[PDB]
């Protein structure tokens, strides 16, 4: 409905890496800021129409792994840092899971 604005003034993680693809699972991975968040916000859908799915996970994780994921999708994958100033504008890509 009513999707919350991201400040794209903020410190943000940065070199966004997405790998060990499976069928039903990828690897998210970033370069964090000096200062780390309290929280990440990661945001993921099937890039042809699906309702997105959403995991928040703390400020010095350098890394999550997604899972339960449909085969043969392509996902856009997001990742929000979470400080008190606010949700920072992040990282996002498209990865298409394996057969």
Same mark, same amino acid.
């Given at each position: 409905?009513?999707?919350?604005?991201?400040?794209?003034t903020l410190?943000?993680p =940065?070199?966004?890496?997405?790998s060990?693809?499976?069928?039903?699972?990828i690897?998210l991975s970033? =370069?964090p800021?000096?200062r780390?968040?309290?929280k990440?916000?990661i945001?993921?859908?099937?890039?042809?129409?699906? =309702?997105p799915?959403?995991?928040v996970?703390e400020?010095?994780?350098a890394?999550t792994?997604?899972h339960?994921?449909?085969?043969? =999708?392509?996902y856009?994958?997001?990742?929000?840092?979470?400080?008190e100033?606010?949700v920072?504008?992040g990282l996002?890509?498209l990865?298409?899971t394996?057969?």
């Amino acid at each position: 409905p009513a999707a919350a604005p991201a400040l794209d003034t903020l410190p943000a993680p =940065t070199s966004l890496v997405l790998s060990q693809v499976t069928s039903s699972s990828i690897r998210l991975s970033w =370069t964090p800021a000096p200062r780390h968040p309290l929280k990440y916000l990661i945001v993921w859908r099937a890039s042809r129409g699906g =309702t997105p799915r959403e995991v928040v996970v703390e400020g010095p994780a350098a890394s999550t792994e997604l899972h339960n994921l449909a085969s043969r =999708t392509e996902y856009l994958v997001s990742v929000f840092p979470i400080y008190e100033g606010g949700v920072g504008e992040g990282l996002r890509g498209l990865v298409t899971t394996a057969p």
